[PDB]
Amino acid sequence: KPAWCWYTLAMCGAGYDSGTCDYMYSHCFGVKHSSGGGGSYHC
Ligand SMILES: *[C@@H]1O[C@H](CO)[C@@H](O)[C@H](O)[C@H]1NC(C)=O
Ligand SMILES: *[C@@H]1O[C@H](CO)[C@@H](O)[C@H](O)[C@H]1NC(C)=O
Numbered sequence: 001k002p003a004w005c006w007y008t009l010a011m012c013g014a015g016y017d018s019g020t021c022d023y024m025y026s027h028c029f030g031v032k033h034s035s036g037g038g039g040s041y042h043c
Contacts, residue, residue: 001028 004023012021025032027039
């Protein structure tokens with residue numbers, strides 16, 4: 001994994017954050033869930 005994530009422990013969401021995440025929603029933990037596809041950037 002990159003220098004942003006760590007594992008699938010799923011820290012945030014369980015009080016670790018203001019229930020708020022970032023890199024996790026980037027399909028790094030497997031918690032995010034959408035109807036379409038997402039996971040894109042305006043690079
Ligand atoms: C969550 O963020 C709020 C500010 O938006 C802050 O006041 C609060 O202490 C934070 N809580 C945690 C667990 O990070
Ligand atoms: C596009 O931006 C990404 C970072 O979001 C960067 O890693 C990549 O090198 C950039 N590619 C080009 C062609 O600018």
